[PDB]
Write an enzyme that holds these catalytic residues in place. Structure first.
Site, PDB file in Angstrom:
ATOM      1  N   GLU A   2     -38.120 -11.781  45.986  1.00 45.76           N
ATOM      2  CA  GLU A   2     -38.826 -11.094  44.875  1.00 45.76           C
ATOM      3  C   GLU A   2     -38.932 -11.856  43.560  1.00 45.76           C
ATOM      4  O   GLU A   2     -39.779 -11.544  42.725  1.00 45.76           O
ATOM      5  CB  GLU A   2     -38.133  -9.744  44.528  1.00 45.76           C
ATOM      6  CG  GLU A   2     -38.081  -8.817  45.724  1.00 45.76           C
ATOM      7  CD  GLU A   2     -39.421  -8.252  46.110  1.00 45.76           C
ATOM      8  OE1 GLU A   2     -40.378  -8.479  45.243  1.00 45.76           O
ATOM      9  OE2 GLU A   2     -39.572  -7.577  47.100  1.00 45.76           O
TER      10      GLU A   2
ATOM     11  N   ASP B  44     -47.683  -7.538  40.699  1.00 43.65           N
ATOM     12  CA  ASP B  44     -47.174  -7.986  41.967  1.00 43.65           C
ATOM     13  C   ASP B  44     -48.320  -8.546  42.814  1.00 43.65           C
ATOM     14  O   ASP B  44     -49.431  -8.717  42.309  1.00 43.65           O
ATOM     15  CB  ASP B  44     -46.369  -6.912  42.701  1.00 43.65           C
ATOM     16  CG  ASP B  44     -47.152  -5.798  43.348  1.00 43.65           C
ATOM     17  OD1 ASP B  44     -48.441  -5.834  43.181  1.00 43.65           O
ATOM     18  OD2 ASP B  44     -46.602  -4.917  43.956  1.00 43.65           O
TER      19      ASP B  44
END
Ligand SMILES: Cc1ccc(C)cc1
Length: 162
Positions: free
Chosen positions: A11, A20
């Protein structure tokens, strides 16, 4: 290696609101703020999650707090999920981590959708599961991450991460 270290590799860590891979507003270590196109909504959500006027920015400490909450939430979610629990219970330690990773990424519902793959996991048919799980939007959208989780399920080792 452990779940946090694993997720931290997959991540990253960003201290400022960011989009994202699907264009969603996120912060920290993969913490989704909102699916809404509005940065304001994102900023609101952030302040509410942090407990202060962040103005789109957080500290490392804050990112790690959110991360701790999200990992706990994922584990508890799995353990409460009728579909997920038995799978989880049937797996060895490393593979459990792989299941936690997916849930953190796509939620219980999303993971619960890999019906056939979950069944194969449950039958300890590693290679078949890996091939089936690769036939998914998930794999096609984030192939590198997907390959790492898939290898972890397939082999039961952390090789993909070392
Ligand atoms: C849900 C899932 C299970 C197994 C693999 C290999 C991928 C995804």
């Amino acid at each position: 290696m452990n779940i946090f270290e694993m997720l931290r590799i997959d991540e990253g860590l960003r201290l400022k609101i960011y989009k994202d891979t699907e264009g969603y507003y996120t912060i920290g270590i993969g913490h989704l703020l909102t699916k809404s196109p509005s940065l304001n909504a994102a900023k609101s959500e952030l302040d509410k999650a942090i407990g202060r006027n962040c103005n789109g920015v957080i500290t490392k400490d804050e990112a790690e707090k959110l991360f701790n909450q999200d990992v706990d939430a994922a584990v508890r979610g799995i353990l409460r999920n009728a579909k997920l629990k038995p799978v989880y219970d049937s797996l060895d330690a490393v593979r459990r981590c792989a299941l936690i990773n997916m849930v953190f990424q796509m939620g219980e519902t999303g993971v619960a959708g890999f019906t056939n793959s979950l069944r194969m996991l449950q039958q300890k048919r590693w290679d078949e599961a890996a091939v089936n799980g690769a036939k998914s939007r998930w794999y096609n959208q984030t192939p590198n991450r997907a390959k790492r989780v898939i290898t972890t399920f397939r082999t039961g080792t952390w090789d993909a991460y070392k």
